[PDB]
Amino acid sequence: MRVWVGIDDTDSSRGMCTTYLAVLAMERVERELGKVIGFPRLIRLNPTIPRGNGAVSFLVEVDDVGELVDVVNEVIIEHAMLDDEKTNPGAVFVDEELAVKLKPFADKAIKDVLQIDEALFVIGKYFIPHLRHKKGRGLIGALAAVGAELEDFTLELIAYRYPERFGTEREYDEESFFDMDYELYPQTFDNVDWCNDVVVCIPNTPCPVLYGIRGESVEALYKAMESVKTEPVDRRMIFVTNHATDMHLIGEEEVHRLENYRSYRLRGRVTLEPYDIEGGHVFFEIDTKFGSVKCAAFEPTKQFRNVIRLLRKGDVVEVYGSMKKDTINLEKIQIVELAEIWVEKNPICPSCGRRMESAGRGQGFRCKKCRTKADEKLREKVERELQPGFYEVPPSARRHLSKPLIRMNVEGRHIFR
Ligand SMILES: [Mg+2]
Ligand SMILES: [Zn+2]
């Protein structure tokens, strides 16, 4: 029997994660019960809920479901850090035929906020077998990993370390990764920030992941793997993911009001012009269908603040990001229509080229150093530095679910390698 297995909430801010444990589980199943069918899936959920918010599923074929539960159960007891207060493992076991009924659930988990009671209701309703070793908060993610429909998807090859070296500093050749990026980009993407000289695919944490490489094909991913120079790789796995799909984005048309803890694409026109602040942050405001909305480019977006700092009143713009504390964290932005600015100003002297000074209330204008004259004010359309089109935050600040420009089929994209 083909059964989908879902798991979340295994993470300890010290030595275990989500994906690692799912690989172990996969190994055990493969050896005790049956075969894992296809690739496992890594499903990131609402990225606003109080880094790295992702559940995992995989398809297996086994003879008996009750044994499957037990196998996974034991994997959890042995490997998950159950003592850690922020670790409430959940897992579910769903007939292939029944996964489809969970698409809406998954959707809501990715875009919205969910309660445990809902997860439980669904489980009771379909007599879904499940594990909840502590709190059942992890059953939300487990159910979502199983239900999620992936129209668009990307792949990530995740390489894990040898246990012996968990918690220690990683060893790797930096150039290795920049070189790998030159070769394969964009079949691999967002693994390096050229502008900021950062290897993005290598985490900063006491976790089992050595590196994770995002990309479009299995071919490219394994190519990336062979070119890269690191300390030895123990386990390795490719997941189909909802990374880089903007799957979390609720469009303005979809909704009456805006809420915090949700993410949006919405168009507006600038009202309150941009202004820096206290910590290296650049705010502004736009008028929208929902009224006045605060947008923000925080310090960690670096050069992306430069393009934001430009725009002026009335500019038509479309914004992408999460709402926290009633302001939108910009991930991406489109300059749609540039505001036309007219200006009436003093005439430029034709000889010396400097600005003509007034000559009195009705007396027109003059340039005294030449012997020159003119009667009416020069009238120019203001020419601004900001081109229309699309702009995004640099890779070192890309959020997991943020669809990067390179993966969009649009005109006027401004990408800075
Ligand atoms: Mg998680
Ligand atoms: Zn002059």
From Swiss-Prot:
DNA-binding region: 265-326
Major subcellular site: cytoplasm
Compartments it resides in: Cytoplasm
Top EC group: ligase
UniProt cross-references to Pfam families, sorted A to Z: TiaS_FLD (PF08489), TiaS_TCKD (PF22641), tRNA_anti-codon (PF01336), Zn_ribbon_TiaS (PF23783)
GO cellular component, one term: cytoplasm
Domain of life: Archaea
InterPro entries: NA-bd_OB_tRNA, TiaS, TiaS-like_TCKD, TiaS_FLD, tRNA_Ile2__agm2C_synt, Zn_ribbon_TiaS
MF GO annotations: ATP binding; ligase activity, forming carbon-nitrogen bonds; nucleic acid binding
Job description of the protein: ATP-dependent agmatine transferase that catalyzes the formation of 2-agmatinylcytidine (agm2C) at the wobble position (C34) of tRNA(Ile2), converting the codon specificity from AUG to AUA.
Protein family (similarity comment): Belongs to the TiaS family.
Stated name of the protein: tRNA(Ile2) 2-agmatinylcytidine synthetase TiaS
